[PDB]
């Protein structure tokens, strides 16, 4: 909303449009650097004011929320590599 200085909602149907165009990098920007990828949005802003190109995005924070919310439901959600080894998307912060 305008009163909160809000961003526009790029909703399910808007994502579909970008998919049908095959605009993979525009869509990925929408899903990460222009929203909840915190490292990405911070890093992209820093690049633009320095004249560099925007960096490759990282994990959207709302995916981390989904993972933690599924754990609260006692479901173990694991990101895996091609070797089926776990990949830690919390970068060591949530493991003892």
């Amino acid at each position: 909303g305008k009163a909160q200085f809000g961003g526009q909602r790029f909703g399910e149907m808007e994502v579909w449009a970008l998919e049908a165009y095959g605009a993979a990098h525009t869509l990925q920007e929408m899903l990460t650097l222009k929203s909840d990828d915190i490292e990405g949005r911070n890093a992209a802003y820093e690049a633009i004011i320095k004249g560099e190109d925007v960096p490759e995005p990282s994990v959207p924070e709302s995916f981390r929320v989904l993972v933690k919310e599924l754990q609260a439901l006692a479901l173990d959600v694991q990101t895996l590599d091609e070797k089926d080894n776990p990949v830690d998307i919390f970068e060591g912060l949530a493991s003892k």
Partner: protein, 158 residues
């Protein structure tokens, strides 16, 4: 707060990973309050409702328990037998995984008994300790419904 413990003995990043002795808080990024899980240790186990109420029940199908049966055990309406220990009810032996009501469980577990109010002042037609048949007359207005040892409760006159 980022890299700052609760009581404020260790307030900056030279210590990262230290756990303050006084207040017990790790010095790291405050972002971890989005990540680290806690837990509650239940005293008695509780079923996860998804594996109960999502039809056909996953627990119910594995154990061959209907929707109604699984409800009755989980929500404390009916017993389920793990080890009958030779019990028998209404003449047939109790088989493991049988559902018992509360009355059925009490008859099996604690035995069967009944108490009859002798009209006040009326003296009993039977004596304390004596074995009794069903139908035997205990007092002018009192007839016993079951076999067993009759027991005096509160003698008014000694």
């Amino acid at each position: 707060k980022d890299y700052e413990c609760a009581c404020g003995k260790y307030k900056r990043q030279r210590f990262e990973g230290k756990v303050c002795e006084r207040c017990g808080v790790e010095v790291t990024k405050s972002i971890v309050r989005r990540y680290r899980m806690g837990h509650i240790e239940l005293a008695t186990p509780a079923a996860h409702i998804w594996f109960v109420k999502d039809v056909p029940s996953k627990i119910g199908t594995l154990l061959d328990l209907s929707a109604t049966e699984l409800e009755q055990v989980l929500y404390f309406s009916k017993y389920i037998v793990l080890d009958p220990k030779g019990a028998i009810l209404n003449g047939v032996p109790v088989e493991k995984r049988q559902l018992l009501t509360d009355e059925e469980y009490r008859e099996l577990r604690y035995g069967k008994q009944e108490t009859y109010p002798l009209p006040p002042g009326v003296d009993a037609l039977v004596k304390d300790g004596e074995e009794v048949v069903k139908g035997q007359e205990l007092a002018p207005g009192v007839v016993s419904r079951l076999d067993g040892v009759a027991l005096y409760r509160f003698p008014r006159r000694v």
